[PDB]
């Protein structure tokens with residue numbers, strides 16, 4: 001029962017690693033298993049070092065394979081993805097399918113969080129719904145993926161000091177106890193603590209301010225320092241903005257933006273980076289470029 | 294032109310019910326006001342300025358010759374720390390708005406008072422509720438200080454000008470729930486020390502209590518920006534002689550509303566000259582008033598005035614039109630108007646216009662007439678004797694209209710005063726120098742203040758250093774910036790960096806990027822031999 005299912009999972013992973021999507025029943029069973037697995041996880045997933053945290057993938061299977069070739073194989077080293085792997089990409093279903101397969105196969109070796117694109121109103125206006133309608137014919141795989149995205153955890157706590165999350169800080173949130181007491185099994189609204197946790201952006205503002213995106217606020221350096229001092233944290237990892245070097249430090253080395261999607265939208269032509277944290281909490285920024293196709 | 298006055302005082306650090314301080318709410322309100330004003334296709338000529346509660350060298354953040362980028366950058370990094378010096382800040386803002394007035398020709402004080410030379414400006418003065426301090430205690434009078442008057446400012450005796458409105462926002466947001474949402478369409482007043490100062494200029498003072506009320510007041514404020522022609526009306530002296538369709542009994546007497554002088558610069562003639570009798574020899578000129586004390590009298594007096602006189606359409610903003618609407622908007626009839634305070638040699642007021650309404654009965658057209666129209670309109674040596682009742686300098690503009698017909702006058706008697714021309718160019722030069730000195734040191738702060746001032750309680754000269762925010766320690770260049778913990782690893786890193794002999798070496802350990810990372814800015818410094826012809 002368990003060995004045959006494990007072998008089926010390995011076969012599914014090997015098939016996905018060759019630009020080959022699964023069938024309707026296989027994706028349905030994978031989404032069901034991921035739903036039963038992610039139910040036990042809390043809003044703040046306690047991740048233990050050593051790890052290799054990544055950023056946005058935005059549905060880029062070739063860039064994901066390049067990342068795996070750069071930052072070690074998936075079963076070998078740990079991975080921490082911070083959302084944005086479903087929209088703005090030609091191969092978007094394959095990336096999320098491989099990620100959820102690795103999650104259901106290596107639940108203790110890989111962690112994935114929820115981003116602003118993991119919803120039902122964003123995937124319909126960025127091409128993911130169109131890709132699911134074109135590839136699988138019907139619109140059931142998209143429904144399964146959007147129903148599964150509600151079970152993804154919000155943030156992650158690495159070594160009790162690093163606080164990884166897609167969007168960023170929130171004005172209605174002052175401690176991690178408020179984040180742990182949130183109902184993540186809900187569609188991302190236009191306002192609230194979860195919307196700010198998934199739509200925030202750092203800047204040199206100071207205090208707060210409305211974001212130009214349309215949702216979430218914009219905090220400054222003093223707010224980041226207050227959040228890091230009132231929760232025992234030493235760093236806040238995020239992946240929501242487009243950078244060039246791959247990693248960007250802000251607020252006196254308090255916020256780290258890690259964009260791991262090389263050649264964003266195939267028009268910028270930038271690099272990407274991941275942060276490998278060793279056992280002694282030593283960080284190394286591994287950079288890479290888009291692999292040639 | 295819009296000059297936003299955000300105090301950024303220490304009293305603006307209290308948190309609202311939403312979770313953000315009053316300063317963050319004020320900045321968000323300013324940003325939404327920007328995005329609301331951008332909807333109207335008229336925001337391509339205005340200029341935004343910023344004024345905070347800081348020292349005179351540090352109060353102004355963005356003034357003249359400052360684009361929107363630096364203004365937004367300065368408003369972004371606003372810090373709320375300091376006392377509530379409202380009077381000094383208002384004085385500094387009014388002096389900043391009156392820097393380029395004595396040089397272009399606006400308010401020349403010698404040739405009438407031209408209303409078509411406008412320089413609109415709206416102040417928001419977003420401050421706290423009450424309890425303003427002046428480093429000694431808490432005052433309750435709000436008196437503007439007079440310590441260093443600008444050269445050429447004693448001719449107005451008031452800080453504000455002909456077109457300078459003052460709106461106010463107090464941001465009285467509760468801290469628990471702000472559940473006060475009974476009256477939907479109702480914006481009350483703040484009832485504070487800034488309320489009389491705002492009402493004197495001509496703008497009300499909103500009382501923000503809820504975010505919905507804030508949005509309502511911001512959407513109501515965007516509809517109150519136009520050409521600034523503010524004149525004051527008085528009921529004296531007719532004892533409410535409105536016996537046309539009913540009996541009079543009122544509050545629509547001291548109307549100090551504005552007038553929309555829309556252009557077709559503005560085009561117009563026949564200005565309100567002055568309020569005094571100008572003499573031929575006068576070294577000292579009496580100070581003018583920002584709001585002209587002009588009074589109207591309810592008399593029919595042949596309201597039909599048809600001639601080749603150049604036409605004016607200075608539209609009046611409806612604020613006290615209830616008294617006119619009570620009399621059916623006075624159809625086919627008007628009432629004269631006259632300026633007080635010795636408009637002539639020996640008389641009390643001279644009718645120089647009327648307030649006839651339009652055919653549509655929508656608003657008041659404010660028909661401005663010459664100094665004395667009912668005589669020159671209807672030569673047998675008559676004009677030579679008639680031109681003695683009008684002020685001398687007033688022969689300037691009217692002669693231009695005579696240019697449409699002929700030219701019987703000359704420059705023989707075109708002289709205002711031999712002493713008024715003197716001591717005027719020097720004042721203009723001093724004002725220009727002051728404006729240049731103010732616009733020069735506008736963004737260069739150069740604080741350089743970091744010391745602890747160690748008191749006795751190397752002697753009498755020691756001062757401990759303070760924590761520098763933007764220090765940027767050079768780890769590879771300076772050896773003192775390397776702490777003890779990561780010393781050996783950093784030593785090996787510096788050794789490998791020096792022994793690598795790479796290209797374009799630097800002294801920074803890890804300088805990722807700045808706060809902003811633009812895509813086009815990085816893509817411009819590249820070369821792509823492709824055009825996508827297919």
Ligand SMILES: [Mn+2]
Nearest residue numbers: 056084240241
């Ligand atoms: Mn994204």
Ligand SMILES: [Mn+2]
Nearest residue numbers: 084115116240
């Ligand atoms: Mn995102």
